[PDB]
Design a protein around this nucleic acid. Structure first.
Ligand SMILES: Nc1ncnc2c1ncn2[C@@H]1O[C@H](COP(=O)(O)OP(=O)(O)OP(=O)(O)O)[C@@H](O)[C@H]1O
Ligand SMILES: Nc1ncnc2c1ncn2[C@@H]1O[C@H](COP(=O)(O)OP(=O)(O)OP(=O)(O)O)[C@@H](O)[C@H]1O
Ligand SMILES: Nc1ncnc2c1ncn2[C@@H]1O[C@H](COP(=O)(O)OP(=O)(O)OP(=O)(O)O)[C@@H](O)[C@H]1O
Ligand SMILES: Nc1ncnc2c1ncn2[C@@H]1O[C@H](COP(=O)(O)OP(=O)(O)OP(=O)(O)O)[C@@H](O)[C@H]1O
Ligand SMILES: [Mg+2]
Ligand SMILES: [Mg+2]
Ligand SMILES: [Mg+2]
Ligand SMILES: [Mg+2]
Lengths: 264, 8, 264, 10, 10, 264, 264, 10
DNA sequence: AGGGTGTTCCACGTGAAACAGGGA
DNA sequence: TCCCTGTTTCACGTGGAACACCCT
């Protein structure tokens, strides 16, 4: 078999990409599945969330895209036995110059991550990519390297205009760069059910997107990550929520999302 | 046997 | 006459940048000051906060930096008489190519926004610039166009590492491109004072940074923007908070902020 | 929404 | 109307 | 035919007896049925609700009970042609002395309303009796003279001990002075459904009493009279709510009550 | 030592007499005064408000007025050390008979509660009497027993005539039975200040009675008990509002009422 | 509910 | 002045999150 | 020191009632 590569992408800032990418990778790993989490963002919050401070690690994902290293070396064992991390650092932001000069040659610049992942695809069950907040090069590499994509949606006004923008960026690559690219699902995040902004933003989303919302096998209802301050607390301890409070609602909801993704 | 401490 | 150019910047996503930049610019126009809001982010949430959705933007901030348009040609008048807006677009993402092909020889590209403002700096009391979530060429341009910077701080764990990174980007520009750049302040945003994490993040911040946080120039208490869903609802109506709901917690906090700007 | 030329919104 | 002698009335 | 005599009774003060007795009598009279309302209370709030002043009335129901008048003379034509009133005043507080004297010859004294009603029962379709806040001689007469009995229930703590206590007074006479006597129905009054007190009081009442609650023919929804300050302001104008605001929720609810009583 | 005997009286049902008589007796008990609550109604809600179910009480208030038991032998200790209770029960409705066999010769049965009281009248700072919804023998007794009278006024239309009838009953007794009887004050209860009818009832009453309404001894504001479902939930736990919720508006109003009483 | 020997509430 | 609006203002229930001390 | 509790505090939605302009 070979890895399903799941990109976690939304270009809106702070909708929960890193928390989703960190906790899904951890929830998938405790099912005895081999998981590679790639911190694909220059802010490097996924790396911090697993408790690797930036100056501990020599060489990062930027140095793999450059070709100084091959991805196999830069990989770290985490607290979890089944969770591996390609860490990031702010030096990864310097890939952006390297992008517009690598599309200047072979039109190969979108695929730099995808070609880098080729050595490691038979080595993992799932590869989870944490993308930064933009539709620029790093998110495009993340999307061109992926079989499927999770969309976190903070259910607030900017998500209406914003989600729509990402789909037609996705639709663009489905007819060009990565034709096999799938929407794995829509993942309501930071969810407070009672709010009239939250109901009305979800209503409008359910008009166009309802089939693609993450749903549960055993219930049949929607999978929604609740607003839980424990999830926000967890990266301060260098941990996924699973290793912080396993009983908490947000940990429960990430383990539900694990179970959907394993099922197919 | 986890050896010398980084991390925490 | 001279405009004070203020940047609202943080590379962390979804921390209150746009909500500050729109509601500060409104709160200053309330006091009868002439205000230009520049939406400097490709996602263009500041423009959509004012009710200009874009099919209707003829030419925008991307066309000024080419020399394709002059800045007076793209300035739009809003509902607030003393507020004007320079709108933003998806086309602003292609400025990132324009920057990096000017660093090979000319190396002057960090000043592209500053020189676009030279035409309008005599005509405004305040020019408020809203920047995207990254430390790349959009933020850097605006941080080097700015006289001062306001840092919106969401009180969760990634603010700790992320702030010190942004200040190091500020110190680097203070020693090269923009020596006259000051920190106008740190504005806590989405504030929920009861949470231990909120207390915990502020304590580590006040340890190093306390002299830089916004204070009421009357009472001496900190100026923090509370978590209020009315500020989240307000851009759905194309309004700043003071037109939407002027008695709400967030509008008062944004008013108090403009008064702490208008003196020192 | 009741008088002027163009801009709406509304 | 109503019987004269106004009373309460309707 | 013959009159159905309905006692509207509760021992608890201020649960809405006079309001249901005034408004059911009017909601039955609008259907073009002949209705006599009897003010059986020394407070004479029913008389006050239909626009009669305590100095306008020459002789009252007390004068019928001692025998100085027969009931046919004491009867006043109200604002509606189908509603007649036997008025009261504070003179009826002198019946109680005349009760323990009139229980002291015979079995007589509990039945003095039954014996006064005999001359006028062929003359009305419905005769509605408004009872005072006590289980003493006036409520006893009212309950002994009647076929069916309405218990208004304010859904608040004292109704629990209270309605169980009145039911036992009912069942004593069902074994004794009036075996024909039945419970017409339970009427929730002053009803605000959101209250946890209201929810809990109606819950405890339901497991004992649900069959005896007034219900719609067209739906099967309970008939509950809402809190409507329009019902409170209506007797100040000398009017039933029907002649006052017929659109209002309390009027609609009393007309529902009329409607379901008419089917029996 | 001289106890000050206070009647809580209105013949209108459901206006707050028991709630007042219980919560004033409690609000005076926490000022370290010795307080005897005499629940003088057959319904006996004040007893039930203090969490005594009516199977517990061997001998009640009714057995004192007979001469069956002496007054000191029926007095219960409550959940507060400074409040004592003389309970009631359904057997108190048989007083009404006893009063009319006391006037077959003696005529003095209006003083039967006053004479029962003189044994405990040196042992108390305050004796609060709670009277039933009627102007009959129970209210008349407790009116001729008391030194003063607090009148609860639910501000709705029937408070207009009923107050005037109650003041006329009171002033009839200043002539004959109790010359020392004076109006301690009027307490608006169930108060909802925004209602036009509430405004309307108060305006007509203030026109005649304004100097008789309870005032705050500092601010000079009217003392009114707000509509609060906390005061209604409170007897379900067998507590006064003080032990139940001491911070709610109904409790503050009753404490404020106790301070005005405690002046003079 | 703890006490309960005095009928009892609290 | 009628029959609609939608806007403001209030009490009340709901649930997350902190924490209090009782768990032994 | 984990633990289960019940409580306290606070944002936010709900709906009745007043009210202010709007209708003619
Ligand atoms: N369900 C949740 N409840 C409460 N807080 C959350 C939740 N999910 C994430 N967070 C917190 O919200 C913030 C934003 O989440 P996160 O950093 O995962 O977003 P992001 O999409 O990665 O942001 P960026 O665009 O900056 O990369 C973080 O501070 C995190 O601690
Ligand atoms: N105090 C507040 N309370 C509640 N919601 C808020 C508050 N401030 C901002 N928001 C909402 O929070 C979300 C994120 O805030 P905002 O979009 O201003 O952050 P940003 O930093 O501009 O995001 P980006 O990183 O995408 O530029 C928005 O959906 C906005 O409506
Ligand atoms: N559904 C209702 N909503 C609001 N107010 C009401 C309602 N029903 C009755 N009222 C008002 O409540 C008060 C008490 O009601 P009412 O006088 O009908 O009770 P009662 O049982 O007749 O009392 P009493 O024992 O004094 O005879 C009155 O002032 C009346 O105006
Ligand atoms: N200020 C208040 N706010 C809300 N509810 C109240 C208030 N005062 C009393 N109540 C509740 O209103 C109801 C009537 O009050 P209460 O029983 O004290 O009046 P009462 O005059 O003793 O009645 P009765 O005529 O039966 O003697 C009770 O169910 C009580 O719980
Ligand atoms: Mg992130
Ligand atoms: Mg923004
Ligand atoms: Mg009545
Ligand atoms: Mg009472």
């Amino acid at each position: 078999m070979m890895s399903e590569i799941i990109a976690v992408a939304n270009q809106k800032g702070g909708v929960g990409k890193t928390t989703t990418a960190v906790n899904l990778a951890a929830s998938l790993a405790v099912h005895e599945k081999k998981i590679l989490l790639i911190d694909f963002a220059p802010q490097a919050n996924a790396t911090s969330s697993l408790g690797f401070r930036r100056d501990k690690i020599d060489y990062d994902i930027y140095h793999v895209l450059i070709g100084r290293k091959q991805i196999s070396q830069v990989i770290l064992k985490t607290q979890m036995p089944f969770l591996d991390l390609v860490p990031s650092n702010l030096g990864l932001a310097g890939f952006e110059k390297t992008f517009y000069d690598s599309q200047d040659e072979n039109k190969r610049g979108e695929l730099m991550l995808k070609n880098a992942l080729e050595s490691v695809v038979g080595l993992y069950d799932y590869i989870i990519i944490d993308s930064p907040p933009a539709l620029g090069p790093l998110t495009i590499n993340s999307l061109s390297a992926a079989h499927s994509v999770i969309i976190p949606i903070q259910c607030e006004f900017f998500a209406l205009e914003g989600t729509k923008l990402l789909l037609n960026t996705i639709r663009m690559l489905q007819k060009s760069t990565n034709p096999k690219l799938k929407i794995r699902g829509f993942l309501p995040t930071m969810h407070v059910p009672q709010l009239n902004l939250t109901k009305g933003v979800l209503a409008e989303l359910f008009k166009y997107f309802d089939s693609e919302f993450f749903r549960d096998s055993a219930t049949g209802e929607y999978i929604m990550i609740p607003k839980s301050v424990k999830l926000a607390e967890s990266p301060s301890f260098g941990k996924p929520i699973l290793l912080y409070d396993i009983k908490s609602n947000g940990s429960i909801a990430y383990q539900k999302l694990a179970q959907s993704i394993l099922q197919g | 046997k986890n050896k010398v401490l980084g991390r925490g």
